[PDB]
Amino acid sequence: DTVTIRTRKFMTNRLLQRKQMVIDVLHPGKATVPKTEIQEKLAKMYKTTPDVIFVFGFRTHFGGGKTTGFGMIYDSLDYAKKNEPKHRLARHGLYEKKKTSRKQRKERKNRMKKVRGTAKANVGAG
Amino acid sequence: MPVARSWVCRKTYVTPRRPFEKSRLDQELKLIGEYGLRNKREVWRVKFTLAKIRKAARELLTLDEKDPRRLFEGNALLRRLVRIGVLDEGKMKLDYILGLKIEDFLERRLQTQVFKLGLAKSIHHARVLIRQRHIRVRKQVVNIPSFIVRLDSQKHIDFSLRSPYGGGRPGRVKRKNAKKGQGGAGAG
Amino acid sequence: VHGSLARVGKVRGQTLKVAKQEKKKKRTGRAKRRMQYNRRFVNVVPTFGKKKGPNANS
Amino acid sequence: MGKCRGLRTARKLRSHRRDQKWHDKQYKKAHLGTALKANPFGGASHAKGIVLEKVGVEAKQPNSAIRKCVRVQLIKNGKKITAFVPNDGCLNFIEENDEVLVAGFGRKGHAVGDIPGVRFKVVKVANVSLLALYKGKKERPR
RNA sequence: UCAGGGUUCGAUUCCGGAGAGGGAGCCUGAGAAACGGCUACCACAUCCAAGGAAGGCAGCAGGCGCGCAAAUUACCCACUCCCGACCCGGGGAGGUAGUGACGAAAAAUAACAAUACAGGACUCUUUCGAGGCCCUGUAAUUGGAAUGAGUCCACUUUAAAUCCUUUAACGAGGAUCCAUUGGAGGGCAAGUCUGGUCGCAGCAGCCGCGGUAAUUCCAGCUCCAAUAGCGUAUAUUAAAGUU
Ligand SMILES: [Mg+2]
Ligand SMILES: [Mg+2]
Ligand SMILES: [Mg+2]
Ligand SMILES: [Mg+2]
Ligand SMILES: [Mg+2]
Ligand SMILES: [Mg+2]
Ligand SMILES: [Mg+2]
Ligand SMILES: [Mg+2]
Ligand SMILES: [Mg+2]
Ligand SMILES: [Mg+2]
Ligand SMILES: [Mg+2]
Ligand SMILES: [Mg+2]
Ligand SMILES: [Mg+2]
Ligand SMILES: [Mg+2]
Ligand SMILES: [Mg+2]
Ligand SMILES: [Mg+2]
Ligand SMILES: [Mg+2]
Ligand SMILES: [Mg+2]
Ligand SMILES: [Mg+2]
Ligand SMILES: [Mg+2]
Ligand SMILES: [Mg+2]
Ligand SMILES: [Mg+2]
Ligand SMILES: [Mg+2]
Ligand SMILES: [Mg+2]
Ligand SMILES: [Mg+2]
Ligand SMILES: [Mg+2]
Ligand SMILES: [Mg+2]
Ligand SMILES: [Mg+2]
Ligand SMILES: [Mg+2]
Ligand SMILES: [Mg+2]
Ligand SMILES: [Mg+2]
Ligand SMILES: [Mg+2]
Ligand SMILES: [Mg+2]
Ligand SMILES: [Mg+2]
Ligand SMILES: [Mg+2]
Ligand SMILES: [Mg+2]
Ligand SMILES: [Mg+2]
Ligand SMILES: [Mg+2]
C-alpha cells in the first residue's frame, strides 16, 4: 500500500501513564486517512491494542501527500479513562453528554434563586 | 475587549509621484512584457524590496569600518543576497550592493526559471503552468508564480508527480474524449 | 427659440438615441498587458519624422 | 536683518515664533475656532437638509447661463444654505419638501467656477444617488 | 508623513487615573467612600385594589433617539486564566461562528499549434522576383490538450459544527463560466472622427469651452490610466526656503 506511519519526538511520560509522539502519514493519491485506520497501525507498531490509543490534530499539507498529528498510547484502559479530556473519550464512545443548552441551565438557576428551604418544583416539576 | 490577535501588518509597495510620465510608463510596460506580470503593482513590489535593501546598505556604508554592528549586519546582508543569486561571491562587499538593478530580483522568480530552465514554451505559458499546479520544487507542489528560487534550490524544479505532463492520469479533457470513442462512437 | 429659455434638460432630451453596436468581449488582466506590449514595442513599421498618435484621425 | 543667534536665546525664539504663527491665515482659522463656529455645516463633510424651493442663479460674466440650484434648510443646525445640482436635467428629480444630502464643492470654503456664492452640491435626493437617478440604474422610490 | 531639521495625531486591546443619571452620607471587611451594596435630596420612570411597593445596560446581545457616521436579543467552557470548602462546580472574562469593499498579504477572467495574410535579419537572382529562419498581430475555422469558479460522496477539522487544506463523480469554445471606474484643449497619458445643440442645455478643482462649421456640452465609434477596484466631500502631512 501507499499509507505509512513514521513517529517523531517520542517521549515516555510516566507522570501520566502514557507515551506520546508525533505521527507522519505518507499517503499520496488518496484522501486523508480515517483516524480508526491510523490507530490500528500504531497498535501493530507498538504491539498493544487499538483501545489504549488516542490520536488528534492531523492537518494535511498543501499539494497532498503528508499529514502530521499528535498521538498518545496509554498503559491501562482506566488510566486513559482518568487522564483523558472527556470529549476525546466521547469520540469513540466511552462517555456521553447531557443537558441540552446553556440557556436552560442558566435560567433554571435564576428561577431557583428566588425561593428558600426547598427549590422543589423548579427542578422536580421543571 | 482584550483579544488574542496580531494586528501587525504592512504595505509592500509605493505608488509613483508623477502619475502620467512617459519615461516611466514606457519602461514599466517594457518590464511587464518581458517577464509577463499582471499589474504595475507587481513591479512596484520589486522596486520596494530593492529600494529598502539600498537603505540598509547605505546606512551601513556610512558607519565606520571595523564597527561591530556594521560588520555583523553586512556579513548578514551579503549572505542573504548571495543565497538567492542576486550577487556574486566574487564581490561580497557593501559598495557593490549599490550596483544592483531591479531586473535581478525579477530574474529569480519561479515563472522566469520555469521558462529559462526549459519546461515551458514562453514566459506566459510558464505562468499558466505554475498556477495550474503542474510544477514541484523539492518533494513539494507550488502554486505561486512570484516564488523566489534560492540558489541551491535551482536544479530541483520539475513536473509534479500527479500531473499529466509526466506520470499522471490524463486530465478531464483527454478522458472525456477517449470516452467519446466508447460512449459516443461505439454505441452513441 | 421656443418654450422656456430656461427649460431644464433641453439638450439631453432632444438628442436622438443610438444603441451600443458591439458584441466582442474585450480582453482582461495579464492578457491585456500582453497585448499592449506587443503593439507598442514588438512590431513598429517604420515612418517619417512626423510621428503619429495611437488614436489619430485627422 | 537681525535674529538672535546666541546660546541661551531659546525662550525668545520660541515665544516669538508662537506669536508670528497667528498672522498665517490658514493656521489662524484652524485655531481661533470662529471659523468652525460659523461653518454652516457642523465641521463635517456632509449634511442632510430639506429642500425649501428651486431657484436659478445667473452666472458671472463673461460666460452666461442660469445654473439650476436648490435652497435647503439643514436638519441639525436648522440654518439655510444654497446648493448646486450637478448634471444636465437633474432639477426634475428634486421634488419640493423632500430631504437631500449636500456635500462640499471642492475648494473648502469658496464658490467654485462661474456661480456667484454657491458653495455646496447635492449627491442624494431620497436615499438614492443623483448619478444613479441620472444614469438609469435606479428610479425614484415613488 | 518624513533628505537633515520638523509638523500633526494618541476615545481605542499594554500601563496609570477617574466615573456608574447629578451631588451627598455610611454599613461590612485585610481591602470600598463600593453602586450587579444600603440610606436621603434633585431629575426621570414603572406597578396599584390609591393603602403601598419597586429602579439605574458608560458589562454582553437588543430597542428608541441623535446624526454624514458604527454588526446577532446565536454557540460553548474544549483552549488562556481567575474564583471557591475545591483533581469534580462557575465564568457574555475568554474562545467559536454570523454580519463586514475600515484596512493589509497572495492572486483567476486564456495557454498552445496548424493555415492564410503582415514584417525583419539571411540566401539566391544585375534587379524584379523566389527560397527562407525569427516575431507580431489578424481571419477562418478549427485542432486537441490544460485547469479552477461551481455542483458534490467520504475523510479531516472542532466542545459540536462551519472554513481552508486532502480526495472520488460531474463541470469551458468565447454570442459565455461576459471587469469596472473615471477621462481624451492645457497642467496630464489619450481623437484638429461622425451625428445632435446654438452664449441655450451644460461642462470646467485652475486657465477656459457653447452666439448654426464645438479637438472641452449630449451620444456612437476609437483611444488612454489604474485594475478586483476606481471617483467625490472633508481633517491632516510632504510640496512650503509660503513660519
Ligand atoms: Mg462596546
Ligand atoms: Mg497685522
Ligand atoms: Mg481671505
Ligand atoms: Mg475669470
Ligand atoms: Mg524622520
Ligand atoms: Mg490613550
Ligand atoms: Mg470625546
Ligand atoms: Mg469603544
Ligand atoms: Mg485602562
Ligand atoms: Mg504607580
Ligand atoms: Mg446613561
Ligand atoms: Mg473579608
Ligand atoms: Mg457611590
Ligand atoms: Mg462593579
Ligand atoms: Mg440594590
Ligand atoms: Mg432605592
Ligand atoms: Mg449595570
Ligand atoms: Mg450594550
Ligand atoms: Mg437615521
Ligand atoms: Mg463605517
Ligand atoms: Mg444608525
Ligand atoms: Mg476553562
Ligand atoms: Mg469545570
Ligand atoms: Mg466576548
Ligand atoms: Mg482591500
Ligand atoms: Mg467573469
Ligand atoms: Mg477551491
Ligand atoms: Mg464530530
Ligand atoms: Mg468608458
Ligand atoms: Mg467629461
Ligand atoms: Mg466625446
Ligand atoms: Mg487635460
Ligand atoms: Mg498629451
Ligand atoms: Mg444646424
Ligand atoms: Mg455642428
Ligand atoms: Mg461636431
Ligand atoms: Mg504642510
Ligand atoms: Mg499660507
Automatic annotation (TrEMBL), chain A:
UniProt biased composition (Basic and acidic residues): 89-98
GO-annotated biological processes: translation
Keyword Protein biosynthesis: no
One Pfam family, short name: Ribosomal_S24e
GO MF entries: structural constituent of ribosome
Secretion signal span: none
Stretches with biased composition (Basic residues): 99-117
SUPFAM superfamilies noted in UniProt: Ribosomal proteins S24e, L23 and L15e
An example Gene Ontology CC term for this record: cytosolic ribosome
Region feature (Disordered): 89-126
Keywords for this protein: Ribonucleoprotein, Ribosomal protein
Recorded family membership: Belongs to the eukaryotic ribosomal protein eS24 family.
Name of the protein in its database record: 40S ribosomal protein S24
Organism whose genome encodes this protein: Oryctolagus cuniculus (Rabbit)
Taxon lineage: Eukaryota, Metazoa, Chordata, Craniata, Vertebrata
